[model samples]
Target: SNISLYCLPYSGGSAAMYYKWRSVLSDNITLRPLEPAGRGTRIRQPLCLTMVDAVADLYQQFVKHYTGGDYAIFGHSLGGIMAFELVHYILDHGHDMPCALFFSGCRPPDRASHEVILHTLPDQAFMEEIVKLGGTPVDVFRNKELMTIFTPIIKNDYRLYEQYVFQAKARTLTCPIVLFHGDADNLVMQDELLAWEKFTTRKTRTIIFPAADHFFVDKHFEQVVGYVNQTIESLEIVG
Candidate 1:
């Protein structure tokens, strides 16, 4: 029996970023990186302006590849919220729930972000705010060509969050949730990560990365993959 792992990317990131994991993940767990419009292979597609549009885009990709098997979802930063909404969307449509949901580098939807809105800032200030988040390389910002292609995509993703209104749900998810956070992540606090407990009925586990920042999933790649493998394996054995 194989399990599908649908991955969503961070803001300004593409589906191809998760391709590297194909060689490393256990063979039984298939990695399916969901591509949103306006990025990666779908570069020609228009960028989604709202959270609803973004989630709908992802839902289309997800159903295309999904054929009723045990599956899980992993999301980072912007993708975290996307994954959360997608799960709700799946439930609304009467589909099987994922075996697990891995939330990385994001706060719960119930909590509003206190950071200043960066999507509306000037080019220089906007880039500075992204740099402070500590994921993209500084050289990419130096290259006008890359920035030209990326700036809009990143800003639109941020705008989705800035404009989103969190509607409290009466139903909680049945699947377990694994919350990942970097101990030193300035943008998302520890309690904010733990706050994910309210969204699910099953157990919620939080894994903290020591000395890690907002991009800890990349910084501590090996450890993250190892833990993911172990978690999935345990689920498989019990499932």
Candidate 2:
């Protein structure tokens, strides 16, 4: 009874970023991250702009890699939004509903995020924004050679993000929805996390880490991954 897990990247992150996560997952699970075109090996491909195009590309990947097992989506920030969209796309197109949803570090789709755009800013300005979010490692940003390679990926992701517009017909998924948030994250509020309730009538659950920031980049990462394990266990038993 194999089950597949699809991991999504936050802004400026790639599948390579979560390589460690796969080792931590249980034997029953296999981790498959969605590698956006603008980053990683697919860098040569033009980054998808709209949610539709992104999903189209992702759906193709899913078709190629699908193992005929129960599948779930684990996405953070921009990827969280993509996860929800993928769920709907699958349902709308007669694909299977997943076992669950694991969303971290972002407000629910219905919530307002009027934050100013930082994707198109100059390299220096972009670094300042990353520092403010406390997500990117200093070494990754400070090095000019690395920054040159990374900046375009970051900007392209933002282009994808900038093109995101929430649809009014947001469907209520039957699968359970799990949430993660950083307690100290001013960028995304707890109340905003609850906004998911309006869209999903599933057994919605929320988990917020104590003292964790917008990235959960601190020491509590093990606990964060443990949440996924426990929820997965519960789901397996129910099955």
Candidate 3:
């Protein structure tokens, strides 16, 4: 129970997203899903407009609750970006570093996102884009009421991504890094996935799931958790 795995939610996702992981994870690893502001239990909280703002908000909460613990981080998609930035924030501000970093369905931090800006898209177009990504449920996109509740939150995350400018000079992490991606995920290529090794002087490993798209974690939670557990065990043995 000494190892805390801080899970970050995807765009428009809440902490509840990782609830299923609880039963399968080993007892040595505690699953702590972090809710973004304006989502999950923090639904009433102010939304973060940019990554810097998010780091600030998350940093306070992280320090307050995780004051002392052996911890690691796990995040997917936009959550991956947040986790990477938070690592820098922690180290630069003189906070304790984690034992490892695990990212799912994300590209290298230094990669420039050439994605079409979708925050300004019309309602239908926004939903269309999300549908194309294959992350959200088909039922939600088909329902106007569900769309109304999710649109702003989703758009907010897009705005944060659109505004982010990855600094080339940012220092690399000292801890090991592990990456997870799906071979079917057109969003991140093999070269891009391998690029994560440059960000850490420590060991870097990437695992690509066959036939898995960007949203693979949704359908393969058990297998992913197993990989996480194995990776954590490997780190401890080597540490």
Q: lDDT tens digits, residues 136-236, model 1? A: 65677678898887888888888887887888875889888888889988778787666788788888888999998887877676777777788898888
Tens digits of per-residue lDDT for model 2, 129-168:
7776665656675678888778777776666766677776
Q: What is the TM-score of each predicted model, taking all chains together?
A: 0.95, 0.91, 0.94
Q: Candidate 1: worst 10 consecutive residues by lDDT?
A: 132-141
TM-score order of candidates, top first: 1, 3, 2
Those runs of model 1 whose alpha carbons end farther than 4 Å from true positions after fitting are 112-114
Question: Which prediction has the highest lDDT against the true structure?
Answer: 1
Model 3 regions more than 4 Å off? none
Q: How high is the CA lDDT of each candidate model?
A: 0.84, 0.77, 0.83
Name the runs in model 2 displaced over 4 angstroms: 217-219
Better of 1 and 2 by TM-score: 1
Residue 131 lDDT, candidate 2, scale 0-100: 72
TM-score of 3: 0.94
Cα lDDT tens digits for candidate 3, 1-239: 47888898777888898999998888899888888899879999999978899978887767756866788899988899999988788788876779889989888887737477887889778878777866565678577888898888988887887778898645767888989888988777678777788888999988889998877888898888998899888877878
Native-structure RMSD, model 1: 1.4
Error of 3 at 130 (Å): 2.0
